[PDB]
Design a protein around this ligand. Sequence first.
Ligand SMILES: Nc1ncnc2c1ncn2[C@@H]1O[C@H](COP(=O)(O)OP(=O)(O)NP(=O)(O)O)[C@@H](O)[C@H]1O
Ligand SMILES: Nc1ncnc2c1ncn2[C@@H]1O[C@H](COP(=O)(O)OP(=O)(O)NP(=O)(O)O)[C@@H](O)[C@H]1O
Ligand SMILES: [Mg+2]
Ligand SMILES: [Mg+2]
Lengths: 331, 331
Amino acid sequence: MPIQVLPPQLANQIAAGEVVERPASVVKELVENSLDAGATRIDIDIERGGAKLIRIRDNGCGIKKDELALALARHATSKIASLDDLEAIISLGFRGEALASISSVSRLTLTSRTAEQQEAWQAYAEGRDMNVTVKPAAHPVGTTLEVLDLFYNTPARRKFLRTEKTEFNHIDEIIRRIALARFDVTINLSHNGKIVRQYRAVPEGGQKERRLGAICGTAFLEQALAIEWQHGDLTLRGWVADPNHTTPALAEIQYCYVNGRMMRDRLINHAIRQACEDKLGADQQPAFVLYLEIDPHQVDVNVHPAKHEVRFHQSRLVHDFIYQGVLSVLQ
Amino acid sequence: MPIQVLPPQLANQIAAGEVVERPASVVKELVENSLDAGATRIDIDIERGGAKLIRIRDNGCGIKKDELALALARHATSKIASLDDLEAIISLGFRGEALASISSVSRLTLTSRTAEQQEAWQAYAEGRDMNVTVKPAAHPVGTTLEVLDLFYNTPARRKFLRTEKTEFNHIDEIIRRIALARFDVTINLSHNGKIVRQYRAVPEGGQKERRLGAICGTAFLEQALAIEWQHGDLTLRGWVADPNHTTPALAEIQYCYVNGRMMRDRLINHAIRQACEDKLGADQQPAFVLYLEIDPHQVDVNVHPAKHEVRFHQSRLVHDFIYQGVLSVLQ
DNA sequence: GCTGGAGGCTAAGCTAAGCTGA
DNA sequence: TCAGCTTAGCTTA
Ligand SMILES: Nc1ncnc2c1ncn2[C@@H]1O[C@H](COP(=O)(O)OP(=O)(O)NP(=O)(O)O)[C@@H](O)[C@H]1O
Ligand SMILES: Nc1ncnc2c1ncn2[C@@H]1O[C@H](COP(=O)(O)OP(=O)(O)NP(=O)(O)O)[C@@H](O)[C@H]1O
Ligand SMILES: [Mg+2]
Ligand SMILES: [Mg+2]
């Protein structure tokens, strides 16, 4: 058997194996792409638990017609030009294996119109080589993605899809986590056409209690302890629940963000777990939302396909900083 | 800010961010390539903790000149042709992004000679466009990879290399895990030219115990309890230590394999952790080397870039099966 | 003697609570 | 004001 180059559709389907875990991961990737384009209104429209239709609409800068084809392509992005840019990144996007993977394992139609361009355009990728065709359409300034029949072309991945309810629950979990990360963009979720969740954006210099309550819950809000802890460029803000009377209903909310990204990292969770176990004695594991800010040069984020976990250049210092911050919180 | 295709060197450097974590990951990837290729003698030579030179030599099938050129390329492999092959994986390779990534973040000089072809060939990929140069060389039947000056051209990642000692410790850990996974191949590790570890291959139907002692110490062997728990298609074989007198020195040995690949999976580790914490006190978490064998269709392995986390189609059944197996072991 | 790095399910069905229609 | 339907929480696989 010879060493032969995989056809681009097959290569993208393999990339979809790591970056597209469930319909929830498709919603996360498309929402992040909209947020990086400076969008303020995000309208997500899940149908049949994401298996049938996932539609995301935004009021972002859009994708001009000629570059629409290269947007759907693989290893093609407008967020890095060289390794130096990758060292100091601010966007939620580095590589071009985001739209390529989803378009490979589904029927992805990309409708967009930039503010400068008068007329909107559609683009969808099909075939063994994933060629893209651009048809004219009507849309306001912004972009709309429709992911239809997810894993239609990969029978094995469809076998992995769970029931309609659980898949929407995972999509709702990702929407809630994105909404907390950015308290400045309105996110409107809708399942089977019936509105499920609406978060109205609090403007810069506003009250953060209302939206956080709508996402976390009233119990978390009345039991929230807002914090601010700085040892230099390391700054840890956010709300931590009180462990004295935390209920199992509140236990599900354990989110941590590093420079505005969703972190499911071992180091940070372990630091909080040690802090909780030291000033309590047992694993009550109280609810918390922590926003950590560091120079992007002290952190490496190109570590995981879905960019959940992160590698810190100052691992022991960051662990000590988070541990001291949570220890101060429990006072 | 236009959408531009990333140059191949940059794209491969980004892939290296996820697949090439440390010199240990480079040793793991190159050793896996040799085993699947069919090798009985693997000779690894780490110099200056992997930072200066990593050389892996095998007695495998080798790579002919034209296929040698495509070996260094990205998305080029001889282990999958279509999705059906990806469903029915019996090899340790799916994508072509491992050698492309290592050749991107280092000076990779692949040298090989197949059994049939007359003479050996040395091939290396260089430049921002990653052109491949194939010069003549001398080598017996098999292949040799030399990774020199790891992360020389990526200063951002070199700062993450810890020391000479720790990097070799991680390489030694991966070598011991590979050796246990296949008791069929001789693996000879050498640091700065001084032999550190030698494991001689036990012939088919041979006694495993002596090699297991060389990898996990005599204490594991006097405290070993072999198992064969089989329910339906699921078979959990291997050796588990006794928690009655387990030392912290033995606690480092917690390896688990799914269809003969090294798993750092959340579901499996969690199941063993629950089983140990139910029939023990003070979180004893005893040492174990357990081989799970499952139908290749009921587990998905294309889940993580470094392939140490699997997605099971029957998550609850597999968790219960492993939990029951370890619970039976602890009596 | 000092120094790195942190193990840690997941999903479906049933029952209870709240809101809307008769 | 009471009954029925939908959504959330809990339990077992
Ligand atoms: N909603 C949007 N509005 C405007 N531009 C967009 C939008 N979505 C995607 N784009 C652009 O289109 C390109 C498509 O590439 P993509 O694969 O999404 O890159 P990425 O976001 O950097 N990838 P990743 O690292 O996986 O997150 C991006 O570089 C964006 O700049
Ligand atoms: N030691 C070796 N001996 C023989 N053939 C080899 C060897 N190493 C690599 N090859 C061949 O070169 C190709 C390149 O493999 P590589 O780029 O590492 O990806 P892969 O191993 O096929 N998949 P992945 O698990 O992602 O790394 C393989 O398909 C093999 O056919
Ligand atoms: Mg993207
Ligand atoms: Mg490989």
